[PDB]
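Q: What changes when fe (ii) ion is included in the input?
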Amino acid sequence: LTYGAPFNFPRWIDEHAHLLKPPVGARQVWQDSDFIVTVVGGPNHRTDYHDDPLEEFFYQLRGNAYLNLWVDGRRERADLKEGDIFLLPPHVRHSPQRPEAGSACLVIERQRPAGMLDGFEWYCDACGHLVHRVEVQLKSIVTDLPPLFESFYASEDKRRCPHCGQVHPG
Amino acid sequence: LTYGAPFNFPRWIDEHAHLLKPPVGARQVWQDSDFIVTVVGGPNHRTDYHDDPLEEFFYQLRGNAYLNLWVDGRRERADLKEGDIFLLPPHVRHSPQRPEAGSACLVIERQRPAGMLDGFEWYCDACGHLVHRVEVQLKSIVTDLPPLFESFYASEDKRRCPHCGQVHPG
Ligand SMILES: [Fe+2]
Ligand SMILES: [Fe+2]
Ligand SMILES: [Fe+2]
Ligand SMILES: [Fe+2]
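A: The predicted holo structure follows.
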């Protein structure tokens, strides 16, 4: 059993509560597995939209959250109330918002094969145009992703909408 | 949203309770998705071991179950007590036993690509030798799998251990 024996999930989440809040916010359950199994806590709000080339499964175990989406060219919202499950199709742009402390969401993804890239995008609050997109071969979320977000927040040029000129807040 | 909006999982399981028992026993949540998301009920005991070429994730939401395994050449058992999660590595032979009525287990698998075959195996209760193995391109569990099991149960020749000659009970 490469990934160990079964174990009690609510107790695991309790024992990792200190990591399910800022600044960490999430915790992957097993390492080096094909299924990426993560528990995401809160609070955490964010402005980036994720373009995942594969599906994402959600089961909101504790508390409530919601996903800001782009669907059919329009901004939409999918609520993840406590007890909700949800399967997100590939490439649907989503921005998870997790307002509640003590919340916990099971999120399951697949490891991306080489050449299958993730995208992270920001959109203009004023005119809705795409402001900035980075594509990334996502291997370790811990090292591959934070610098991406920091480099966007640090640069007015990256944050500048090419259509209406308004600078994204970061 | 190809797969619909989020929805309350405990209520979904309640509304499908009549299918989480014999003769059906399980119910896939979404169709035509890359992630195969199934709720498995009970009671159900079985004698076949599954050789899945990809991982299997378990979260035992209601009631208790256990997996009979082969691990390092020996017969073992992994208990899925209520609240347990578990990630099974590829190819570990497993035979789920679900003794309890009203139990419900979330099981998540991946659709197998072409050329990646599942195996289903039976082992001799007397000498532990492999009795029969069928490999299958698993596309629809509903049509691809029941005839496999029936053809094994119907044939003393398939059930006959090639090492000690004892006929498997089916
Ligand atoms: Fe995502
Ligand atoms: Fe703009
Ligand atoms: Fe299996
Ligand atoms: Fe035998």
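Observations recorded in class: Residues 76 and 89 of chain B are 15 Å apart (CA to CA).
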